[PDB]
Amino acid sequence: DSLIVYQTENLIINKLSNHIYEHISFLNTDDFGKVACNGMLVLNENKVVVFDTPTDDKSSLELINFVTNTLKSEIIGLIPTHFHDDCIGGITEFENHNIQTYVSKETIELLKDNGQEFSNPTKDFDNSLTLDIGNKKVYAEYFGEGHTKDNVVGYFPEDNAVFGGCLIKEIDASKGYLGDANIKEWSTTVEKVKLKYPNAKIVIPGHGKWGGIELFDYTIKLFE
Ligand SMILES: [Mg+2]
Ligand SMILES: [Zn+2]
Ligand SMILES: [Zn+2]
């Protein structure tokens, strides 16, 4: 089970295993309640890969400073899992620490369709990304359209860990925001994620409580 290793009004970090930490930050984009938004920190040999910026610059700086001063580590790469602001909201702060961004090509196109470009040159991938993190490996993979057309999934096999992002719901979630979604394909997409990760023990959805592969099952059935 999970240790809280950092907590503040702007940022919560939960330690789930020896290599896998969950970061939680809060979107306040309108005149209504803030919404909790999850990402994944993968740690190995004092090197860190982050799936999803926290929601803004100040939350992202709390995360970077936590990695530097408390995990005594370097962040070697940022992988935004799609183009919404619960994935790239703090991108400027990461770019200002010269953290390499790794992002899919469809994600770049949708960002550009929406008027945004990364400032620092990105490292781009079509469907699948393999990154070395010291002597272990971390992956991002595109399985199909869901929550958005570009959504990718993070995977660290050493701890059997999957960052579902917003393609994956928590147990008993509502459907949520569908403005950019492909509802005809969401569930077949997650069937593929399930097929690829039968031994997953840690599955982190984009919002709400993490758990096991039952998050896959629940999300498949939600959009059937
Ligand atoms: Mg696994
Ligand atoms: Zn989204
Ligand atoms: Zn989301």
Author numbering: 32 to 45, 47 to 100, 102 to 107, 109 to 131, 133 to 150, 165 to 205, 209 to 211, 215 to 228, ...
Copy text verbatim from the article accompanying this structure deposition.
The structures of MYO-1 and ECV-1 were successfully solved by X-ray crystallography to 2.17 and 1.33 Å, respectively. Due to lack of electron density in chain B, the regions of N60 to K66, L93 to I96 and K104 to S105 could not be built. These cysteines (Cys69, Cys121, Cys221) were in the vicinity of Asp120 (3–5 Å). Interestingly, this loop was shortened by one residue at position 231 in both MYO-1 and ECV-1.
The class B MBLs are enzymes with the ability to hydrolyse virtually all β-lactam antibiotics, including carbapenems. Phylogenetically, MBLs can be grouped into three subclasses, B1 to B3.2 While enzymes belonging to subclasses B1 and B3 carry two Zn(II) binding sites (Zn1 and Zn2), B2 MBLs are mono-Zn(II) enzymes. Here, we investigated three of these B1 MBLs,6 SHD-1, MYO-1 and ECV-1, in comparison with the clinically widespread enzyme NDM-1.
